[PDB]
Coordinates of C-alpha atoms in Angstrom, one line a residue:
Chain A
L1 CA -14.3 10.9 -47.8
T2 CA -16.2 9.8 -50.9
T3 CA -13.3 11.2 -52.9
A4 CA -10.9 8.9 -51.1
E5 CA -13.4 6.0 -51.5
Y6 CA -13.5 6.4 -55.2
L7 CA -9.8 6.0 -55.5
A8 CA -9.8 2.7 -53.5
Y9 CA -12.7 0.4 -54.2
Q10 CA -13.0 1.6 -57.9
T11 CA -9.9 3.2 -59.1
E12 CA -7.8 1.0 -56.9
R13 CA -4.9 3.2 -55.8
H14 CA -3.0 3.9 -52.7
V15 CA -4.6 6.9 -50.8
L16 CA -3.9 9.0 -47.8
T17 CA -6.5 11.3 -46.0
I18 CA -5.7 14.2 -43.8
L19 CA -8.3 16.5 -42.0
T20 CA -7.4 19.8 -40.5
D21 CA -8.9 21.9 -37.7
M22 CA -11.3 19.1 -36.6
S23 CA -12.3 21.5 -33.7
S24 CA -13.9 24.1 -36.2
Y25 CA -15.7 20.9 -37.7
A26 CA -16.9 20.0 -34.2
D27 CA -18.2 23.5 -33.6
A28 CA -19.8 23.5 -37.1
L29 CA -21.3 20.0 -36.2
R30 CA -22.6 21.8 -33.0
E31 CA -24.3 24.5 -35.0
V32 CA -25.7 21.8 -37.4
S33 CA -26.9 19.7 -34.5
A34 CA -28.5 22.8 -33.0
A35 CA -30.2 23.4 -36.4
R36 CA -32.5 20.6 -35.3
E37 CA -33.3 22.9 -32.4
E38 CA -32.5 20.1 -30.0
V39 CA -31.3 20.6 -26.4
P40 CA -27.5 20.3 -26.7
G41 CA -25.7 17.8 -24.4
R42 CA -22.7 18.1 -22.2
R43 CA -20.7 21.3 -22.7
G44 CA -22.7 22.1 -25.9
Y45 CA -22.2 19.0 -28.0
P46 CA -24.6 16.5 -29.5
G47 CA -25.0 12.9 -27.8
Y48 CA -24.8 11.4 -31.2
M49 CA -21.2 12.7 -31.7
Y50 CA -19.9 9.2 -31.1
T51 CA -21.9 8.0 -34.1
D52 CA -20.9 11.2 -35.8
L53 CA -17.2 10.4 -35.5
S54 CA -18.0 6.9 -36.1
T55 CA -19.2 7.5 -39.6
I56 CA -16.0 9.4 -40.2
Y57 CA -12.8 7.7 -38.8
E58 CA -14.5 4.5 -40.3
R59 CA -13.5 5.5 -43.7
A60 CA -10.0 4.3 -43.4
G61 CA -8.7 0.7 -44.0
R62 CA -7.6 -2.0 -46.2
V63 CA -10.1 -3.9 -48.5
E64 CA -9.8 -7.6 -49.3
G65 CA -9.3 -8.2 -53.0
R66 CA -8.7 -4.5 -53.6
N67 CA -5.1 -3.4 -54.2
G68 CA -5.9 0.2 -53.4
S69 CA -6.0 1.2 -49.6
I70 CA -7.1 4.5 -47.9
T71 CA -5.3 5.7 -44.8
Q72 CA -6.6 8.6 -42.6
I73 CA -4.7 10.8 -40.1
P74 CA -6.9 13.6 -38.8
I75 CA -5.8 16.7 -36.8
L76 CA -7.6 18.3 -33.9
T77 CA -7.0 21.1 -31.5
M78 CA -7.5 20.2 -27.8
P79 CA -9.7 22.7 -26.0
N80 CA -8.0 25.2 -23.6
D81 CA -4.9 22.9 -23.7
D82 CA -6.8 20.2 -22.0
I83 CA -7.0 16.4 -22.8
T84 CA -10.4 16.1 -21.0
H85 CA -11.9 17.8 -24.0
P86 CA -14.9 16.1 -25.7
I87 CA -13.1 16.0 -29.0
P88 CA -9.9 14.3 -27.4
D89 CA -12.2 12.0 -25.4
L90 CA -14.2 10.8 -28.6
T91 CA -11.1 10.3 -30.8
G92 CA -9.3 8.6 -27.9
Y93 CA -11.1 5.3 -27.6
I94 CA -12.2 5.4 -31.3
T95 CA -8.9 5.9 -33.1
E96 CA -5.9 3.9 -32.8
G97 CA -3.0 5.7 -30.9
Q98 CA -2.6 9.4 -30.7
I99 CA -0.1 12.0 -31.8
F100 CA -0.1 14.9 -29.3
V101 CA 1.8 18.4 -29.2
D102 CA 4.0 19.6 -26.3
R103 CA 3.5 23.2 -25.8
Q104 CA 7.0 23.3 -24.0
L105 CA 8.8 22.1 -27.1
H106 CA 6.9 24.5 -29.4
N107 CA 7.7 27.5 -27.0
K108 CA 11.3 26.7 -26.6
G109 CA 12.1 27.6 -30.2
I110 CA 12.7 24.0 -31.5
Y111 CA 11.4 21.7 -34.1
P112 CA 8.1 19.5 -34.3
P113 CA 6.8 19.2 -30.8
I114 CA 5.3 15.8 -30.4
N115 CA 5.9 14.6 -26.9
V116 CA 7.7 11.2 -27.0
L117 CA 5.7 9.9 -24.0
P118 CA 2.2 10.6 -25.7
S119 CA 3.3 9.6 -29.3
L120 CA 1.9 6.0 -30.0
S121 CA 0.6 4.0 -33.0
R122 CA -1.4 0.7 -32.9
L123 CA -0.4 -0.3 -36.3
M124 CA 3.3 0.2 -35.3
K125 CA 3.5 -3.6 -35.1
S126 CA 2.8 -3.9 -38.9
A127 CA 4.6 -1.0 -40.2
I128 CA 8.2 -1.9 -39.0
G129 CA 10.6 -4.9 -39.2
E130 CA 12.5 -6.5 -41.9
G131 CA 10.6 -6.2 -45.3
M132 CA 8.4 -3.5 -44.0
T133 CA 10.6 -0.6 -42.7
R134 CA 13.8 -1.9 -41.1
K135 CA 15.0 -4.5 -38.6
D136 CA 16.6 -1.7 -36.5
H137 CA 13.2 0.1 -36.1
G138 CA 11.3 -1.1 -33.2
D139 CA 14.2 -1.9 -30.6
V140 CA 16.0 1.3 -31.3
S141 CA 12.7 3.2 -31.2
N142 CA 12.1 1.8 -27.7
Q143 CA 15.6 2.4 -26.7
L144 CA 15.6 5.9 -27.8
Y145 CA 12.2 6.6 -26.1
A146 CA 13.5 5.0 -22.9
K147 CA 16.6 7.2 -23.3
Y148 CA 14.5 10.3 -23.5
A149 CA 12.2 9.3 -20.6
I150 CA 14.9 8.3 -18.3
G151 CA 16.7 11.4 -19.6
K152 CA 13.8 13.5 -18.3
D153 CA 13.8 11.7 -15.0
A154 CA 17.5 12.6 -14.7
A155 CA 16.6 16.0 -15.9
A156 CA 14.5 16.5 -12.8
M157 CA 16.9 14.5 -10.5
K158 CA 19.9 16.7 -11.6
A159 CA 17.5 19.7 -11.0
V160 CA 17.3 18.4 -7.4
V161 CA 20.7 17.3 -6.1
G162 CA 22.7 18.9 -8.9
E163 CA 25.2 17.6 -11.5
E164 CA 27.8 16.4 -9.0
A165 CA 25.5 13.6 -8.1
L166 CA 25.1 12.5 -11.6
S167 CA 25.3 8.8 -11.9
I168 CA 26.4 6.5 -15.0
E169 CA 23.1 6.0 -16.3
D170 CA 21.9 9.4 -15.2
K171 CA 24.7 11.3 -17.0
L172 CA 24.2 9.0 -20.0
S173 CA 20.5 9.8 -20.0
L174 CA 21.5 13.6 -19.7
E175 CA 23.6 13.5 -22.9
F176 CA 21.1 11.2 -24.6
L177 CA 18.1 13.4 -23.7
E178 CA 20.0 16.6 -24.7
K179 CA 21.0 15.1 -27.9
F180 CA 17.6 13.6 -28.7
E181 CA 15.9 16.8 -27.9
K182 CA 18.2 19.1 -30.0
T183 CA 18.8 16.7 -32.8
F184 CA 16.5 13.7 -33.1
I185 CA 13.6 15.9 -32.3
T186 CA 14.8 18.4 -34.9
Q187 CA 13.5 17.6 -38.4
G188 CA 12.7 20.7 -40.4
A189 CA 9.8 22.8 -41.9
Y190 CA 9.6 21.3 -45.4
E191 CA 12.2 18.7 -44.6
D192 CA 11.5 15.1 -45.2
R193 CA 14.2 12.5 -44.2
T194 CA 14.1 8.8 -45.4
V195 CA 13.5 5.9 -43.0
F196 CA 17.1 4.8 -43.7
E197 CA 18.3 8.3 -42.6
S198 CA 16.1 7.7 -39.4
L199 CA 17.6 4.4 -38.4
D200 CA 21.1 5.6 -39.3
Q201 CA 20.7 8.8 -37.3
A202 CA 19.1 6.8 -34.4
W203 CA 21.9 4.2 -34.2
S204 CA 24.5 7.1 -34.5
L205 CA 23.0 9.2 -31.9
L206 CA 22.4 6.3 -29.5
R207 CA 26.1 5.3 -30.2
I208 CA 27.0 8.0 -27.7
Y209 CA 26.1 5.6 -25.0
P210 CA 28.1 2.2 -24.8
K211 CA 27.1 -1.1 -26.0
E212 CA 25.9 -2.3 -22.6
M213 CA 24.3 1.1 -21.7
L214 CA 21.2 0.1 -23.6
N215 CA 19.2 -2.8 -22.2
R216 CA 16.6 -2.1 -24.9
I217 CA 18.7 -3.7 -27.4
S218 CA 18.8 -7.3 -28.8
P219 CA 22.1 -9.2 -29.3
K220 CA 21.5 -10.1 -32.8
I221 CA 20.6 -6.4 -33.6
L222 CA 23.6 -5.1 -31.8
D223 CA 26.0 -7.5 -33.7
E224 CA 24.4 -6.9 -37.1
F225 CA 23.7 -3.2 -36.9
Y226 CA 26.3 -1.3 -34.7
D227 CA 29.2 -0.4 -37.0
Chain B
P1 CA 65.3 10.1 -26.0
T2 CA 67.0 12.6 -28.4
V3 CA 64.0 15.1 -28.2
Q4 CA 64.0 14.4 -24.5
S5 CA 67.7 15.1 -23.9
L6 CA 67.6 18.1 -26.4
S7 CA 64.6 19.6 -24.5
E8 CA 66.4 19.1 -21.3
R9 CA 69.4 20.7 -22.9
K10 CA 70.3 24.4 -23.3
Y11 CA 70.6 26.8 -26.2
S12 CA 71.9 30.3 -26.7
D13 CA 69.6 31.3 -29.5
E14 CA 66.0 31.9 -28.8
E15 CA 64.8 30.5 -32.0
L16 CA 66.9 27.2 -31.4
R17 CA 65.2 26.7 -28.1
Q18 CA 61.7 27.6 -29.2
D19 CA 61.9 25.3 -32.2
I20 CA 63.4 22.6 -30.0
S21 CA 60.4 22.7 -27.6
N22 CA 58.0 23.0 -30.6
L23 CA 59.6 20.0 -32.4
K24 CA 59.7 17.9 -29.2
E25 CA 56.1 18.8 -28.5
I26 CA 55.1 17.8 -32.2
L27 CA 57.0 14.5 -31.9
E28 CA 55.5 13.8 -28.6
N29 CA 52.0 14.6 -30.0
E30 CA 51.8 11.8 -32.5
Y31 CA 54.3 9.4 -30.5
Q32 CA 52.0 9.0 -27.7
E33 CA 49.5 7.7 -30.2
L34 CA 50.6 4.4 -31.7
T35 CA 49.5 2.4 -29.3
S36 CA 47.2 5.4 -28.3
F37 CA 47.5 6.5 -24.8
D38 CA 45.2 9.4 -25.4
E39 CA 42.6 6.8 -26.3
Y40 CA 42.5 6.0 -22.7
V41 CA 42.5 9.7 -21.8
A42 CA 39.2 10.1 -23.6
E43 CA 37.7 7.3 -21.5
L44 CA 39.0 8.9 -18.4
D45 CA 37.8 12.3 -19.5
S46 CA 34.5 11.0 -20.4
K47 CA 34.7 8.9 -17.2
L48 CA 33.6 5.8 -19.2
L49 CA 35.8 2.7 -19.8
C50 CA 35.2 -0.2 -22.0
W51 CA 36.6 -3.7 -23.1
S52 CA 40.1 -3.0 -24.6
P53 CA 43.4 -4.6 -24.1
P54 CA 44.8 -1.2 -23.0
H55 CA 45.9 -2.3 -19.5
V56 CA 46.0 -5.9 -20.6
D57 CA 48.8 -5.6 -23.2
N58 CA 52.2 -5.3 -21.6
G59 CA 53.4 -3.2 -24.5
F60 CA 50.6 -0.7 -24.1
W61 CA 51.6 -0.5 -20.4
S62 CA 55.1 0.2 -21.4
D63 CA 54.2 2.9 -23.9
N64 CA 52.3 5.1 -21.6
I65 CA 54.5 4.0 -18.6
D66 CA 56.5 7.2 -18.9
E67 CA 53.3 9.4 -19.0
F68 CA 51.9 7.8 -15.9
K69 CA 53.4 10.6 -13.6
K70 CA 54.2 14.1 -14.9
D71 CA 53.6 16.7 -12.0
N72 CA 52.9 15.3 -8.7
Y73 CA 51.4 12.1 -10.3
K74 CA 48.9 14.2 -12.3
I75 CA 48.0 11.2 -14.5
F76 CA 47.7 8.9 -11.5
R77 CA 45.8 11.5 -9.7
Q78 CA 43.4 11.6 -12.6
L79 CA 43.3 7.8 -12.6
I80 CA 42.3 7.6 -8.9
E81 CA 39.9 10.5 -9.0
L82 CA 37.5 8.6 -11.1
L83 CA 37.3 5.5 -8.8
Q84 CA 37.3 7.7 -5.6
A85 CA 34.6 9.7 -7.2
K86 CA 32.8 6.5 -8.0
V87 CA 33.4 5.5 -4.3
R88 CA 32.5 8.5 -1.9
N89 CA 29.4 9.5 -3.9
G90 CA 27.3 7.3 -6.3
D91 CA 29.0 3.9 -5.7
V92 CA 26.1 1.9 -7.1
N93 CA 27.4 -1.3 -8.4
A94 CA 25.2 -2.4 -11.5
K95 CA 26.4 -3.2 -15.1
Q96 CA 28.6 -0.4 -16.4
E97 CA 29.9 1.2 -13.1
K98 CA 31.1 -2.4 -11.9
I99 CA 33.2 -3.4 -15.0
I100 CA 34.5 0.1 -15.3
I101 CA 35.6 0.4 -11.7
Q102 CA 36.9 -3.1 -12.0
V103 CA 39.0 -2.2 -15.1
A104 CA 40.3 0.8 -13.2
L105 CA 41.1 -1.4 -10.4
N106 CA 43.1 -3.7 -12.6
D107 CA 44.8 -0.8 -14.5
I108 CA 45.7 1.0 -11.2
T109 CA 47.0 -2.3 -10.2
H110 CA 49.3 -2.8 -13.2
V111 CA 50.3 0.9 -12.5
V112 CA 51.2 0.5 -8.8
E113 CA 52.9 -2.8 -9.9
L114 CA 54.8 -0.8 -12.4
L115 CA 55.6 2.3 -10.3
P116 CA 57.0 1.4 -6.9
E117 CA 56.9 5.0 -5.7
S118 CA 53.1 5.2 -6.7
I119 CA 52.1 3.7 -3.4
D120 CA 52.7 6.9 -1.3
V121 CA 49.8 8.5 -3.0
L122 CA 47.3 5.8 -2.6
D123 CA 47.4 6.1 1.1
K124 CA 47.0 9.9 1.1
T125 CA 44.3 9.9 -1.6
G126 CA 42.1 7.6 0.5
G127 CA 42.8 5.0 -2.2
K128 CA 44.1 2.4 0.2
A129 CA 40.9 2.4 2.1
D130 CA 38.6 2.4 -1.0
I131 CA 40.7 -0.4 -2.4
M132 CA 40.3 -2.4 0.9
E133 CA 36.7 -1.4 1.0
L134 CA 36.5 -3.0 -2.5
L135 CA 37.5 -6.3 -1.0
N136 CA 33.7 -7.2 -0.5
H137 CA 31.5 -6.5 -3.6
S138 CA 28.5 -7.7 -5.3
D139 CA 30.3 -9.2 -8.2
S140 CA 32.9 -11.9 -8.1
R141 CA 34.9 -10.2 -10.7
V142 CA 35.0 -6.8 -9.1
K143 CA 36.1 -8.6 -5.8
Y144 CA 38.7 -10.6 -7.7
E145 CA 40.3 -7.4 -9.3
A146 CA 40.1 -5.7 -6.0
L147 CA 41.6 -8.4 -4.3
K148 CA 44.2 -8.5 -6.9
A149 CA 44.9 -4.8 -6.1
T150 CA 44.9 -5.6 -2.4
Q151 CA 47.5 -8.3 -3.1
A152 CA 49.2 -5.7 -5.1
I153 CA 49.4 -3.2 -2.2
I154 CA 50.5 -6.3 -0.4
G155 CA 53.2 -7.1 -3.0
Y156 CA 55.6 -4.5 -1.5
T157 CA 55.6 -3.6 2.2
Chain C
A1 CA 27.5 16.7 9.1
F2 CA 26.5 13.0 9.3
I3 CA 24.2 13.9 12.3
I4 CA 22.5 16.8 10.5
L5 CA 22.4 14.6 7.5
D6 CA 20.2 12.2 9.4
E7 CA 18.1 15.0 10.8
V8 CA 17.6 16.6 7.5
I9 CA 16.9 13.1 6.0
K10 CA 14.2 12.7 8.7
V11 CA 12.8 16.1 7.4
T12 CA 12.5 14.7 3.9
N13 CA 10.9 11.5 5.2
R14 CA 8.4 13.6 7.1
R15 CA 7.6 15.4 3.7
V16 CA 7.1 12.0 2.1
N17 CA 4.8 11.2 5.0
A18 CA 2.7 14.3 4.2
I19 CA 2.9 13.8 0.5
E20 CA 1.7 10.2 0.8
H21 CA -1.6 9.7 2.6
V22 CA -2.1 13.4 3.5
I23 CA -1.6 15.8 0.6
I24 CA -2.4 13.2 -2.0
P25 CA -5.7 12.2 -0.4
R26 CA -6.6 15.8 0.4
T27 CA -6.3 16.7 -3.3
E28 CA -8.1 13.6 -4.4
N29 CA -11.1 14.3 -2.2
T30 CA -11.0 18.0 -3.1
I31 CA -11.0 17.1 -6.9
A32 CA -13.7 14.4 -6.4
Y33 CA -16.1 16.7 -4.3
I34 CA -15.5 19.6 -6.8
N35 CA -16.1 17.2 -9.7
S36 CA -19.4 15.9 -8.2
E37 CA -20.5 19.6 -7.3
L38 CA -19.7 20.9 -10.9
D39 CA -21.2 17.9 -12.7
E40 CA -24.3 18.2 -10.5
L41 CA -24.6 21.9 -11.3
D42 CA -24.2 21.1 -15.0
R43 CA -26.9 18.6 -14.6
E44 CA -29.3 21.1 -13.0
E45 CA -28.6 23.6 -15.7
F46 CA -29.0 21.0 -18.3
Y47 CA -32.3 20.1 -16.7
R48 CA -33.3 23.7 -16.9
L49 CA -32.4 23.7 -20.6
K50 CA -34.2 20.4 -21.2
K51 CA -37.4 21.9 -19.7
Chain D
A1 CA 28.7 28.3 12.7
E2 CA 30.9 30.5 10.6
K3 CA 32.0 32.2 14.0
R4 CA 33.1 28.9 15.3
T5 CA 36.9 28.8 14.6
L6 CA 38.3 27.9 18.1
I7 CA 38.7 24.5 19.8
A8 CA 37.8 24.0 23.5
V9 CA 39.2 21.0 25.3
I10 CA 38.3 19.1 28.6
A11 CA 40.7 16.2 29.1
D12 CA 43.3 14.7 31.4
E13 CA 47.0 15.7 31.9
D14 CA 48.6 13.9 29.0
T15 CA 45.9 14.8 26.4
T16 CA 45.9 18.5 27.5
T17 CA 49.7 18.7 27.3
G18 CA 49.7 17.0 23.7
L19 CA 46.9 19.0 22.4
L20 CA 48.2 22.3 23.8
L21 CA 51.6 21.3 22.4
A22 CA 50.0 20.8 18.9
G23 CA 49.1 24.5 19.2
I24 CA 45.4 24.3 19.5
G25 CA 45.3 26.2 22.7
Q26 CA 44.5 29.9 22.8
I27 CA 43.7 32.6 25.3
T28 CA 41.4 35.4 24.6
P29 CA 43.3 38.5 26.0
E30 CA 40.2 40.6 26.6
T31 CA 38.1 38.0 28.4
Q32 CA 41.3 36.3 30.1
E33 CA 39.3 33.1 29.2
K34 CA 41.2 29.9 28.0
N35 CA 40.3 27.3 25.6
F36 CA 42.1 24.5 27.5
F37 CA 41.7 23.2 31.0
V38 CA 43.5 20.2 32.5
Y39 CA 41.1 17.8 34.1
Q40 CA 41.4 15.3 36.9
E41 CA 39.0 12.3 37.4
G42 CA 39.2 12.5 41.1
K43 CA 39.3 16.3 41.9
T44 CA 37.1 17.8 39.2
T45 CA 33.5 17.7 40.2
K46 CA 30.6 16.6 38.0
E47 CA 28.8 19.9 38.4
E48 CA 31.9 21.8 37.1
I49 CA 31.9 19.3 34.2
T50 CA 28.4 19.9 33.3
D51 CA 28.8 23.5 33.8
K52 CA 31.8 23.7 31.4
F53 CA 29.8 21.5 28.9
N54 CA 26.8 23.8 28.7
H55 CA 28.9 26.9 28.7
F56 CA 31.2 25.6 25.9
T57 CA 28.2 24.2 24.0
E58 CA 25.6 27.0 24.2
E59 CA 27.0 30.1 26.0
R60 CA 29.7 30.5 23.4
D61 CA 29.0 31.3 19.6
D62 CA 32.8 30.8 18.7
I63 CA 33.2 27.2 19.8
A64 CA 33.8 24.9 16.7
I65 CA 35.0 21.6 18.4
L66 CA 35.0 20.3 21.8
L67 CA 37.4 17.6 22.9
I68 CA 36.8 15.3 25.6
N69 CA 38.5 12.2 27.2
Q70 CA 36.5 9.0 27.3
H71 CA 37.1 8.5 30.9
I72 CA 35.8 12.2 31.4
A73 CA 32.9 11.7 29.0
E74 CA 31.6 8.6 30.8
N75 CA 31.0 10.8 33.9
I76 CA 28.6 13.1 31.9
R77 CA 27.4 10.6 29.4
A78 CA 23.8 11.8 30.2
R79 CA 24.7 15.3 29.1
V80 CA 26.6 14.1 26.2
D81 CA 23.7 12.1 25.0
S82 CA 21.5 15.0 25.6
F83 CA 23.5 17.1 23.2
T84 CA 22.0 16.5 19.8
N85 CA 23.1 19.7 18.0
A86 CA 25.5 19.4 14.9
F87 CA 27.7 22.0 16.5
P88 CA 30.0 21.6 18.2
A89 CA 30.8 18.2 16.8
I90 CA 31.1 15.5 19.4
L91 CA 34.2 13.1 19.4
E92 CA 35.1 10.9 22.3
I93 CA 38.8 10.2 22.5
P94 CA 40.8 7.8 25.0
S95 CA 42.9 9.1 27.8
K96 CA 46.0 7.8 29.7
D97 CA 45.0 4.6 31.7
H98 CA 41.7 4.9 30.0
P99 CA 41.3 3.3 26.5
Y100 CA 38.5 4.4 24.1
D101 CA 35.3 2.6 24.6
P102 CA 33.1 2.8 21.4
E103 CA 29.8 2.4 23.3
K104 CA 30.8 4.9 25.9
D105 CA 30.7 7.6 23.3
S106 CA 27.1 9.1 23.5
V107 CA 26.9 10.4 19.9
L108 CA 28.6 7.3 18.5
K109 CA 26.2 5.3 20.6
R110 CA 23.4 7.1 19.0
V111 CA 24.8 6.3 15.6
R112 CA 25.3 2.7 16.6
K113 CA 21.5 2.3 17.1
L114 CA 19.7 1.6 14.1
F115 CA 23.0 1.1 12.4
Chain E
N1 CA -11.0 14.5 4.3
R2 CA -11.2 18.1 2.9
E3 CA -14.2 19.3 0.9
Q4 CA -14.9 22.7 -0.5
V5 CA -18.6 23.5 -0.9
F6 CA -18.0 26.3 -3.8
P7 CA -16.0 25.4 -6.8
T8 CA -15.7 26.8 -10.4
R9 CA -13.6 24.5 -12.7
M10 CA -10.4 26.6 -12.8
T11 CA -9.9 25.6 -9.1
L12 CA -10.2 22.1 -10.3
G13 CA -7.3 22.6 -12.5
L14 CA -5.2 24.4 -9.8
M15 CA -5.8 21.6 -7.5
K16 CA -4.9 19.0 -9.9
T17 CA -1.8 20.8 -11.0
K18 CA -0.7 21.3 -7.5
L19 CA -1.5 17.7 -6.8
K20 CA 0.7 16.3 -9.6
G21 CA 3.5 18.8 -8.8
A22 CA 3.5 18.0 -5.1
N23 CA 3.7 14.4 -6.3
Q24 CA 6.8 15.0 -8.2
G25 CA 8.2 17.0 -5.4
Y26 CA 7.5 13.9 -3.3
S27 CA 9.4 11.8 -5.7
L28 CA 12.2 14.2 -5.8
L29 CA 12.3 14.2 -1.9
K30 CA 12.2 10.5 -1.9
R31 CA 15.1 9.9 -4.2
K32 CA 17.0 12.7 -2.3
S33 CA 16.2 10.7 1.0
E34 CA 17.7 7.7 -0.7
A35 CA 20.8 9.4 -1.5
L36 CA 21.2 11.2 1.7
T37 CA 20.5 7.8 3.5
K38 CA 23.4 6.2 1.5
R39 CA 25.8 9.1 2.1
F40 CA 24.9 9.3 5.8
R41 CA 25.5 5.5 6.1
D42 CA 28.9 5.8 4.4
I43 CA 29.5 8.8 6.9
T44 CA 28.5 6.4 9.7
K45 CA 30.9 3.6 8.9
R46 CA 33.6 6.3 8.3
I47 CA 32.5 7.7 11.7
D48 CA 33.0 4.4 13.5
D49 CA 36.2 3.9 11.7

């Protein structure tokens, strides 16, 4: 943290922070808190853990008058596959947005298993748009997410009455879900694709549906993007 | 017409007849697409229509006119199967389904107007009843196309 | 088939009646009481540890 | 249900003649029982009608459809309404001198309510 | 309502999972009831006809 701090306020350069296995650092912090021989709190964790994380995640931000900014994206293992975990509950109200992992998508032999429902970012408003990322970013993101969600609802509905009862939006969401899951979701091990490749693959994959099949799209966007 | 008459003709040699059917099929392969009639076939197979002047342009209607009825009105049966399936089951009129069923109504209307012998099927396919049941709909456009098809069945009695 | 379709539909509705104020509420009460008992037991153990 | 392939009929002269003419009639050689019986409004007693109804509906596992004249069905509207099973399917049809009343059909009446 | 005196914590997970799952099953039965109602309605109009 001090290392990232030196490259921002002093050296003035763009920095990115990444923490791995925060759960082990939490158990370590538990042994360290028990080093004061204090009676532990709920589920064997210090009551000052809120402040312990508050002196950690507060190391990220942009400084006024300084060109160099430091950004942090920590990683933590949720206990026993539970979101009720003290770690998740502590980073939940503190950090902005959360990127989870779907055990279903990891055990199905597919790529990166971030559940589309759970995936969110609070700074997503400032990181997209014309001049930031792309004008096709937010609207198509919401459209693809809605396609995956409605696609899941249709996945359950088709698992009920069958595929003979598939409706227009239902079948459209079925193809959209199958595609988004086996393609959009698929990225790579070392593979890094550009934002332009993301917007293009998004418009192209969402092109499977008609122009009026997406109520999540704006007219100006649809006229200046789809081609 | 030359390939049609030659295919309808006879040949003593096996190679002559086989090459005749192959050449006629080869011609009919890209001839149907000009004016692409297969273009609508993709929409029917995918069961999703759109805004195109396929049934609107009289020329396009004349181009695929001969391909409208093959075996027991196979193309016509495939044409009424989509609307019938959008009738007996599903049949929820909002956005896509409405404009698609309406376009199918106008297209099947131009078809019945073109083919006078195409009526006998609509009664036995339950299409007369679905078309008449399409008289009252949520959208004025769907009701207009359906009433147009109703007057179309009313055109020849 | 229509008549049966009604009867079976009624059956489905009955399930909806049971899955509404019955099963859901029962599960809610069970989860709440279990949560209270567990949190209280943890509170007692934590009291023993504090002592 | 799968065993139900035969059609039983209770109706007036014209209806019985027409239906039997169509070829729907059949006589089980072993039981010597028939799947058709000509009915008369004046002569056939209500008890025999109810008996035939109950026998065709519950006593036989091979009945698929029971045909009945509207005029005849009105006489046993009670028993008809009382029948709620999906099989045999209940269809009220008209007879000579007795046109089909929609509200007279017990099943169709049941369907009418709550429309 | 229903209360169980003796609970572990795993039992809470089983009850919670059974609850969410029965909720989803309720949704499925509901949509199924909607479709079956529409179908029975069309079959009713067809029956009068």
